[PDB]
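## Example record

The block below lists the input lines for one assembly entry, exactly as stored, with component labels intact.
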Amino acid sequence: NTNMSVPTDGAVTTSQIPASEQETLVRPKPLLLKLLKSVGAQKDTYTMKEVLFYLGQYIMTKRLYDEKQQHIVYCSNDLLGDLFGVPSFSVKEHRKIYTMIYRNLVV
Amino acid sequence: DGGTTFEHLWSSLEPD
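Predicted structure tokens for the full assembly:
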């Protein structure tokens, strides 16, 4: 008996195989590299998670986002927003985030 | 969603 109703989290692959692709390291530009390496990036190749990590440092440390709404990043007059293809951006739009970064990498 | 910190929602927006 087990009254502890817990999900059996394990590598159980009967019908499906986990949808997991090798996290593609993205290709940067000098502009990205300057922001990355200036916020503590040791890498020259980095995955999407690492973009979130390092690119987020840049937005934070420069305080390019709004004062009242953290989910609203202006970064206007900077290269960041520009390069994303935007005047400002919302971190709520995941798809936009991917594409704004993807705009700057080669695949 | 309230006022979720830029620190988290940005760094946690990746698929998996």
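DSSP finds one helix and no strands in chain B. The CA atoms of residues 2 and 15 of chain B lie 22 Å apart.
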